[PDB]
Design a binder for these strands. Structure first.
Ligand SMILES: [Cl-]
Ligand SMILES: [Cl-]
Ligand SMILES: [Cl-]
Ligand SMILES: [Mg+2]
Ligand SMILES: [Mg+2]
Ligand SMILES: [Rb+]
Ligand SMILES: [Rb+]
Ligand SMILES: [Rb+]
Ligand SMILES: [Rb+]
Ligand SMILES: [Rb+]
Length: 135
RNA sequence: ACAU
DNA sequence: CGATGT
């Protein structure tokens, strides 16, 4: 209903899907960029959205922050809830990097705890998430 | 259909 | 137009 401005927002950016994947996290209130992942040569939009949330979890945990995370990705929110990224992307030599990061993110979720609420950014009511790439 |  | 997902 109301934006929780005291929060972290994350988003993926890509060149192609599958294609070059990156992601970032911003302070919802100000747009300040808090983290950015170096581009990964081949991945999917949803793998990037998933990695972005998990990185946000790890970022806030390290800083003892109880802020929620906003994502616009129905898929990635569910994957994080399940601790399982159900991606269709073929596992081969050229997707090995994205799949390593996805596998490592699942592994982190399965060995750590957090109470961070992971919230759906309501794009239809609020406009584009503040972490959007503008592509 | 909804979310990207 | 195409692709990723529930
Ligand atoms: Cl990552
Ligand atoms: Cl909350
Ligand atoms: Cl959701
Ligand atoms: Mg997004
Ligand atoms: Mg976006
Ligand atoms: Rb901590
Ligand atoms: Rb967008
Ligand atoms: Rb965009
Ligand atoms: Rb969106
Ligand atoms: Rb579809």
């Amino acid at each position: 209903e109301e934006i929780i401005w005291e929060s972290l927002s994350v988003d993926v950016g890509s060149q192609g899907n599958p294609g070059i994947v990156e992601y970032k996290g911003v302070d919802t209130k100000t747009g300040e960029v808090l983290f950015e992942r170096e581009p990964i040569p081949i991945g999917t939009n949803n793998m990037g959205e998933f990695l972005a949330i998990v990185h946000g979890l790890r970022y806030l945990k390290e800083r003892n922050s109880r802020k929620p995370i906003y994502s616009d990705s129905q898929t990635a929110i569910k994957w994080v809830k399940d601790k399982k990224a159900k991606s269709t992307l073929v596992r081969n030599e050229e997707t090995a990097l994205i799949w390593k990061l996805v596998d490592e993110a699942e592994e982190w979720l399965n060995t750590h705890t957090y109470e961070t609420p992971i919230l759906k950014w309501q794009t239809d009511k609020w406009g584009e998430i503040k972490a959007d790439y503008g592509r």
